[PDB]
Amino acid sequence: MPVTEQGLRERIESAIPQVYHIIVTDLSYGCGQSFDIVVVSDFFQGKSKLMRSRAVNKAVKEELQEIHAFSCKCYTEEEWSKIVVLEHHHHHH
């Protein structure tokens, strides 16, 4: 009600610099306070995931006020590491 999952993506995009990709997914059924979104950016470069949360709150402080509890997963291939990515990008139909 107070926040829209679809609208959230737009807010996030406008709440942060045009990152590589922004995705908003609601973990709870339909609408709810719980939110789960994933975004990839260099913002996580040289900074820990926990640190990003603090920056995100400042960037989207109003979002937190509207949202009782939400998550914002962020990665930049760093977590994956060089190891063996084997690309494995997307999949065939």
CA distance 53 to 62: 14
How many structural domains are present in the chain? 1
Cα of 33 vs its chain's centroid, Å: 16
Which technique was used to obtain these atomic coordinates? NMR
SS3 of residue 59 by DSSP? helix
Residues ≥6 apart with Cβ < 8 Å to 63? 3, 8, 11, 12, 15, 70
Full domain range(s) for residue 91: 1-93
